[PDB]
Design a protein around this ligand. Sequence first.
Ligand SMILES: CCCCCCCCCCCCCCCCCC(=O)OC[C@H](COP(=O)([O-])OC[C@H](O)COP(=O)([O-])OC[C@H](COC(=O)CCCCCCCCCCCCCCCCC)OC(=O)CCCCCCCCCCCCCCCCC)OC(=O)CCCCCCCCCCCCCCCCC
Ligand SMILES: CCCCCCCCCCCCCCCCCC(=O)OC[C@H](COP(=O)([O-])OCC[N+](C)(C)C)OC(=O)CCCCCCCCCCCCCCCCC
Ligand SMILES: CCCCCCCCCCCCCCCCCC(=O)OC[C@H](COP(=O)([O-])OCC[N+](C)(C)C)OC(=O)CCCCCCCCCCCCCCCCC
Ligand SMILES: CCCCCCCCCCCCCCCCCC(=O)OC[C@H](COP(=O)(O)OCCN)OC(=O)CCCCCCCCCCCCCCCCC
Ligand SMILES: Nc1ncnc2c1ncn2[C@@H]1O[C@H](COP(=O)(O)O)[C@@H](O)[C@H]1O
Lengths: 40, 347, 49, 320, 100, 459, 120
Amino acid sequence: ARQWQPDVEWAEQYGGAVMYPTKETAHWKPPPWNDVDPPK
Amino acid sequence: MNPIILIIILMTVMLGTIIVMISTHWLLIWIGFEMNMLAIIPIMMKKHNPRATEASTKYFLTQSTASMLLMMAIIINLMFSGQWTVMKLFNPMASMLMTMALAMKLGMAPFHFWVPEVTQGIPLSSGLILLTWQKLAPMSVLYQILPSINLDLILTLSILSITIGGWGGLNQTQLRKIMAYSSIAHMGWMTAVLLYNPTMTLLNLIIYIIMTSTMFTLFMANSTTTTLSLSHTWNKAPIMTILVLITLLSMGGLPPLSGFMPKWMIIQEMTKNDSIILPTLMAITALLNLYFYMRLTYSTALTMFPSTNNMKMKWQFPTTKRMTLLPTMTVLSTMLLPLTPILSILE
Amino acid sequence: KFYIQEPPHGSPNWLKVGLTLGTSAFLWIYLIKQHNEDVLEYKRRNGLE
Amino acid sequence: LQYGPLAYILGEKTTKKMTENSKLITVDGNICSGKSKLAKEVAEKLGLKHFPEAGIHYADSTTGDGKPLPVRFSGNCSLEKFYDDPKSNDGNSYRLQAWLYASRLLQYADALEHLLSTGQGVVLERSIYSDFVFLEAMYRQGFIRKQCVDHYNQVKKVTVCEYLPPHVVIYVDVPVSEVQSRIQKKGNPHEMKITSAYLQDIENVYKGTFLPEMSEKCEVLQYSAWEAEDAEKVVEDIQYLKYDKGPWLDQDDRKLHNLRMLVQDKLEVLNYTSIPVFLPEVTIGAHQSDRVFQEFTELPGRKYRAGYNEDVGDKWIWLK
Amino acid sequence: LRWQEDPEPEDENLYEKNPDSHGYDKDPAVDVWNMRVVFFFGFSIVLVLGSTFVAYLPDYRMQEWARREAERLVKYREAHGLPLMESNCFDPSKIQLPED
Amino acid sequence: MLKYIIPTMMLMPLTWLSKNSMIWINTTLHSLLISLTSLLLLNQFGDNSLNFSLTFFSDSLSTPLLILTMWLLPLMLMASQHHLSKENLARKKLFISMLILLQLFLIMTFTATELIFFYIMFEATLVPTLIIITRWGNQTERLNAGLYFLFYTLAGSLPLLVALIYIQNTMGSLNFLILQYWVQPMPNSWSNTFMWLACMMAFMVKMPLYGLHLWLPKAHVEAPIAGSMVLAAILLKLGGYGMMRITLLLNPITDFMAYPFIMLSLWGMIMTSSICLRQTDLKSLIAYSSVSHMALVIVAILIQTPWSYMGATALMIAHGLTSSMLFCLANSNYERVHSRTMILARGLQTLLPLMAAWWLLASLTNLALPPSINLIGELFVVMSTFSWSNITIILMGLNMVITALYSLYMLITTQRGKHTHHINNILPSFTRENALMSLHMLPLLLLSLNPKIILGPLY
Amino acid sequence: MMTGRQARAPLQFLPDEARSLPPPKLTDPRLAYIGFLGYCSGLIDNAIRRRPVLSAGLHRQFLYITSFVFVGYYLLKRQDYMYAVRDHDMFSYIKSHPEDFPEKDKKTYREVFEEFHPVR
Ligand SMILES: CCCCCCCCCCCCCCCCCC(=O)OC[C@H](COP(=O)([O-])OC[C@H](O)COP(=O)([O-])OC[C@H](COC(=O)CCCCCCCCCCCCCCCCC)OC(=O)CCCCCCCCCCCCCCCCC)OC(=O)CCCCCCCCCCCCCCCCC
Ligand SMILES: CCCCCCCCCCCCCCCCCC(=O)OC[C@H](COP(=O)([O-])OCC[N+](C)(C)C)OC(=O)CCCCCCCCCCCCCCCCC
Ligand SMILES: CCCCCCCCCCCCCCCCCC(=O)OC[C@H](COP(=O)([O-])OCC[N+](C)(C)C)OC(=O)CCCCCCCCCCCCCCCCC
Ligand SMILES: CCCCCCCCCCCCCCCCCC(=O)OC[C@H](COP(=O)(O)OCCN)OC(=O)CCCCCCCCCCCCCCCCC
Ligand SMILES: Nc1ncnc2c1ncn2[C@@H]1O[C@H](COP(=O)(O)O)[C@@H](O)[C@H]1O
C-alpha cells in the first residue's frame, strides 16, 4: 500500500564485479573495500 | 607522501602539460610528455598497494610505447621537412604514427585497454588527474596538427571510441571503470569534431572536464568507489544524491543541461560538412552512456537502497573534507546551456 | 552553552569575513570602474557623446 | 579547519611534541576485572587522559551536547537485551557488537588524535585490538552466525590496518568464579544472566589469541586481581619499560602526519564500518532508515552543522 | 529476519479524527481554508469569470467581421452584374505562364 | 509570453519559502491565478498568429494547449496532495518543484517560435517527468517504466535534432514564421525519405504510434497521479503539436510517405481499443484508451486536410481533459482499495453515488457523446478520413463501437453489479476528490457551448 | 576557424579593437543569469556543508555572486568581440570577392513556376 523501495534481492544485483555475469565473468570476485590486497 | 614532494610532483605534472601547450618545437613536446608521465607515476602509487603498482606498470608501458611512436613521427617529420616546428606534419606516415601516439595517450579505442584498469587501480583524486589533466596535452598536439590528420583514421578512432566506451560501462558496478568508459566515449566525441571545428573540440573538452571533476569531487566527498556504496548516500547526505542526479543527467546529454551543449554543437558542425550518418550514429550510441548514467541515478537518487545500522553513527559527524569548487562545478555542469554562445571565446 | 565541544564554527572567522567583504567590495568597485572606462572609451572611439 | 598539510609544511612536526609521557596504554580484562578504576588510577599517576570504555553512547558523548541520544538513533541495540535474549531473532547480538566496534574505532581515533595533537598519552579500556574477543566468545556460544564473523573480519581487515597498536597493553587475570562473584556483588539484574561458558570463552580468546599476537607488536603487562588493586606497582612497572617492539619506533613526521590527517576526519575513520554487505543483523531497510534519519534531523542541535543552530543558541549565523 | 524494517502502516482515515473533513489536510483549519481556496479561485474566479471572458471575446479570429464584410461585397457585386466569386483568385493578366 | 514564464518561475520561491502546512494551498491558489491569466492568449486573429517576440508566439493551435497546460497544474496539485501526506517536507517541495518546472518547460514548448528551442523544451520535459515517475511512483516497475519512457523518446528524437539542424543549415532559419514563407517542396528521394522519418518519428513515439506505444502502458500505470495526468493530458500532445508544425516542411513527400503510418494507426486504434475490452487493470485500460484516441490524431495530421486538423486539435484538448479525469477517478478508487484491479471493487454506485455520476460523465465523454468536444473532434476526424478514403468509415465506425464497449464496461465493472462484500474501507467521497472531478468535467462541458476556441489555426 | 586571426596578437583575452565595441550593460540578462549562477553556487555551498541554505554565510553568497558577475562580464566582452570579428571578416571577405557572391535577381511569383501538389 506504501511506496516500493528496493530490498536486498534488488540491491545485490549491483554488488558483483560486473553487472551482467557471463561464463567468463563468473570467477571475478568484487575488489576489496580499501583496494588493498593481502601480500601473498 | 611528504606534502612538499606532493606539491613539487603536481607542479611537475602541470609543468609537463604547460611545456606541451606553449612550445613550438617537437622535442619540447616530447620532453613535456616525458615529464608529465614521469611525474604522474608517483601520483598513481600514492597508496602503495598492488593495484596501484599494476596500474602504474600498465600506464608506464602504454605511455612509453606512445612516446616512442611520437618520437618516431617527429624524426620522420624531421626527415621529410628538415625542421622541428609544431604545425602540420609533412608525411602521412608521421601523421599516422603521431595520431596513433596521441590516441594511445588519450586512451581512445582500440588503444582503450588501459583506461578502466589504470583508473580502477589508483585513488579517486589521481583518477581525476588522469581523466582530466592528462587529456589536455594530447588534445593540444591534435589541435596543432589537424591539417595533417587523416580523416578516416581520426573518425574511425572517434566512432570506435564512442561505441566501445558506450558498451563498456553497461557491464560495470565500479565507479572508476564507469568514469573510464565515459572518458573513452567522450574523447571519441571530441576527436570526431576535430577536423570540422576544433573550437567544438575545446568546448567538449572543457564541459567534460567540468562534469568529470564534479563527479569525482562528489565521489571523494561521499568516499564512494562502488555503485552499491554510492547507493548509501541518501541516508548520509541527501543533497549529494541530488547533485549526482543532476550531474549524471547532465553527462548523458539531456537538455536543458550543459552536457547537452557539446554534443549538439558537434552535431551542429558535422551536418554543415554534409555528414549526416556519422553524428546520428554518435548520438544514438550516446544512449548507452545515458543508460548506465541512469542506472547510477536509479541506485543513488531516484530510489533508496537499504543501508546499514552503522550509518547512524555517521549522522553525528559532518564532512570536514575540502570539497574544492564543488558547488561552482555543480552549477557549471548543469545550468550552463542558456550561456551556450559563450563557446566563441574558445575560437 | 549547548555543545560539549567548542565547534570550529562557533564564532565567525572575522579575518575571513573581512577578507570576503573586502574582496567582494574591491571586485564591485573595479567592475564598475572598468565598465565606466569601457563606455567612455566606446563613446570616444565612436564619437557617441 | 585547524590541521592540514599547510600546518605540516609551516613547521608543525608531530614528533617535536612526542615525549616519553606520550604513551597510548590500553587496559584490558574480563567483564568485571576491576580494571574500570585501575585505568583511571594509571591516568592519575602518569598524568595521562583517561577515556572511559566505549558503550553504545560514546559517539553521543563526543558530539552535540554530550548527552546520550535515544537508542533508536544510536545503536538500535541494547546490551541488556543481549544479556536477556542472546540468541534473539532480531539479531541484537551482532548488531550490538558491530555498533560497539564502530564506537571503539571512534574512541581509538579520539585517542590517537589527542596523542598526536597534544602529546599527552591516552589510557583506553578495551581498544579495537581487543574487541574481537567478545565476537569470538559470542560465536563460540552460538549467539551469532558465521556470516556475522565474516562481516566483522572484513570491517576489521579494512579498518584496523591503518592504525598503530598501543604502546602498553595491561591485562588483568581474574578467574571465572571471581568474575561471577563480582557480578553477583554488582547488583545488575541483567548482568547476572551471563553464562559461565561465555566468560570462559572471553578468557580463552584473551589468553589464546589476543595476548600471543599482541605480545610482538606491543608490551603486555599481565597482572592478577590482588596486584591490580595497587596502582603504584603497575605504574612503576610502566615507567621502567624498554620500548623496543612494535611499529611505533619507525614512525617519522610523515607517517604520523598521514595518520593524523586520517584520524581527525571522522567520516573517513567510520568509512568502512558501513560497507554494503547485506547482513540481516545490521541491514536496516529503506523506510525505517528514512524515518529514523528524518527523526534524527529534528533533534535539537542536530539539524545543521555544529555552529549553525538557532534552536540551541548559535549567533552570527549570517556571517558564518 | 531479512532487512530490518518498519512494518507497513495502516490506512489512515481522515474522517475519524475529523468528521468534517474536506480531504485536504489533517489539520481542520488548514483543511477548511484549502477548501475555500480551491472553491473560490477554482469556481468563482476561473470558471465563472473565465466563461464570462470567453463569452465576450472581441470577435474571435474575425469570424463576425468576415461575415459582415461578405455582406458588403455580395451587395457590391449583386448590384453591378458581377459574379459572386471568380474561379481565379488572382488576376490572370498579372501571371506569366511557362510557355509551351 | 514572458508574463506566463515568470509567474511559473516565481512559483519556485512560492513553494520553497512557504510554511510547512501552506505549500499546497499557496501553489494551488497562485497556479489558479496563472490559469485565470492564461485566457489572455485568446487574442487570436483570423489571419495572423499572436506573435509576441523573436522567441515566443502563440497561434490558435498552441493557445488551447497552453490554457489546458496552465489549468492542469492546480488539478495535479489537488490530486497529488493526498498520497503525499506522510511525505517529507523537502521531498514534498521537490515534487511540487518538478510539477512547476514541467509546466515551465511545457508553456515554452508550445510557444517556441524557433524549432530547435521547441526541441530543447520538448526534450527538457523528460527530466521532471522521469523524476516524477521513477521517484514518486508506487510499484517496482516504475524504474523500467522510466527506462522505456526515456529510451523510446530519445531514440525517436535524436534523429529529429539532426533533421532540424539540417533545416537550419539548408533553409537558414528554424523560425516557424520564416519557414511559412520559405518552405520549399520536399521531392521524392531517399535522402528526403529519411528526412521525413527523422522529422516525424519523434512525434510518432510521443503521440504514441501503434507499435511504438509500448512505453505508455508502463509509464501511465507506474507514474503517480500528477504524472499520469500530465502524460495523458499534455505530454502526448507534444507529438501532435510538433507534427502540425513540422508537416509544413514535409510536403509533398507526406502524400506518399504517410501511408504506413496511417495503416498502423487505423488498425492500431482497432487493436488497442480491443485491448481495453480485456484489461484487468483499470489504469492500463485508460492508458490503452489514450493510445486508441491519439491514433485518430495521428491519422488526422497525416492526411493534412483542414477539417482533420480542426478535429485533431479539438480531440487533443478533449482527450486531455477526459483522460485526466479518468486517471483521477481510477486514483479515487486506488486510494481506497490500494489495488488497480478493476474487478476488485465493484458495485460502487451503491457506495459512492455522486462519484458514480462523475464516472458516468467521464465514460460518456470517453465514448464521444454529442455535443461534447470529444464528439466534435472524433466526428471531424471521421469526416476528413471519409474524404480521404470512403472505406475508412469501417475502421472508424467499428472503433466507435468498441470505444463504447469499454467506456461502459469500465462503468459496469467498477460502478455496477453487486458490491464486493469483503471491502469495507470504502470512504465517502472527499470534497477534494469531487472538486477534482468537477474541475475536470465542467470546463469540458462548457467548451461545448463555445468550441471555436479549441479548433486550431484554421477555424 | 578564426585561429589565424588571433595569431599576430597571441594570448590577448581582449585586444585593443575590442574597445571599439560597446561593452555589455551591467543589466545584461546574460550577466544576470551568471549572477543567478553565483547565487545558486552559494546555495549549494550552504547545502552540502549542512548550513542553513538561505541564512548562513551571506558574505560568502555575496562573494559567489560578485565573483561570477565579475568573471562573466569579461567572458561576455570576449564573446561579443569574437562574434564581431566573425561578422567583420565575413563582410570583408564578401566585399573583397564579388565574383564569388553574385547579386541575385529575385523573381516575383508571377514568373516563378511552382508545381501544385493537391491534398485530396
Ligand atoms: C456559460 C454559462 C453556462 C450555464 C449552463 C451550464 C452549461 C453546461 C455546464 C455543465 C452542466 C452539467 C453539470 C452537472 C453535472 C455534474 C454534477 C452532478 O453530478 O450533478 C448531479 C447533481 C444533482 O444530483 P443530486 O440529486 O443532488 O445528487 C447526485 C446524485 O447522487 C448522482 O447524480 P445523478 O445520477 O442523479 O446524475 C447523473 C445524470 C446523468 O444523466 C446523463 O448523463 C444524461 C444527460 C446527458 C446525455 C443526454 C443529453 C445529451 C446532450 C443533449 C442536451 C444538451 C443540448 C441541448 C440543446 C438543444 C439541442 C442541441 O447527470 C445529469 O443528469 C446531469 C445533467 C447535465 C448533463 C450534461 C451532459 C453531460 C453528459 C456527457 C457529455 C455530453 C455532451 C456534452 C453536453 C454539453 C452541454 C452544454 O447536480 C448538481 O448538484 C448541480 C450542481 C451545479 C452544477 C453547475 C454546472 C455549471 C458549472 C459551470 C460554472 C461556470 C459557469 C457558470 C454557469 C453556472 C450554471 C449554474
Ligand atoms: C480551452 C482549452 C483548455 C481546456 C480547459 C480550460 C480550463 C480553464 C477554464 C476557463 C474558463 C472556461 C473556458 C470555457 C468557457 C466556455 C463557456 C463560454 O464562454 O460560452 C460562450 C457562449 C457564447 O455564446 P455565443 O458565442 O453564441 O454568444 C455570442 C457572443 N456574445 C455573448 C458576445 C453576444 O456562451 C453561451 O452560449 C451561453 C448561453 C447561455 C448559458 C447556457 C444556456 C444553456 C443551458 C442549458 C439550457 C437547456 C439545454 C438542455 C438541457 C437538458 C439537460 C442537460
Ligand atoms: C523510434 C525508433 C525508430 C527510430 C527511427 C528514426 C527515423 C528513421 C530514420 C533516421 C535517419 C537518421 C537521421 C536522418 C536525418 C536526415 C537529414 C537529411 O537531410 O539527410 C539527407 C542526407 C543526404 O546527404 P546530403 O543531403 O548531405 O547530401 C547533399 C545533397 N545530395 C544528396 C544532392 C548530394 O542523408 C544522409 O546523409 C543519410 C540519411 C539516412 C541516414 C541513415 C543512417 C541512420 C539509419 C536509421 C537510424 C534510425 C534510428 C536508430 C535507433 C533505433 C533505436 C535504438
Ligand atoms: C582547452 C584547454 C583548457 C584548459 C583549462 C585549464 C583550467 C584549470 C585546470 C582544469 C583541469 C582539471 C583540474 C583538476 C585536476 C585534478 C586536481 C586534483 O586531483 O587535485 C587533488 C585534490 C584532492 O582532494 P583531497 O580530498 O584533498 O584528496 C585526498 C587525497 N588525495 O582535489 C581534487 O581532486 C578536487 C578537484 C580540484 C580541481 C577541480 C576544479 C578545477 C577544474 C574544474 C573546472 C573549473 C572552472 C574553470 C576552468 C574551466 C576549464 C576546465
Ligand atoms: N563487544 C562487546 N560485546 C558485548 N558486551 C560488551 C562488549 N564490550 C564490553 N561489553 C560489556 O561492557 C561491560 C564492561 O564491564 P566494565 O568492566 O564494568 O566496564 C560488560 O558488561 C561487558 O559485557
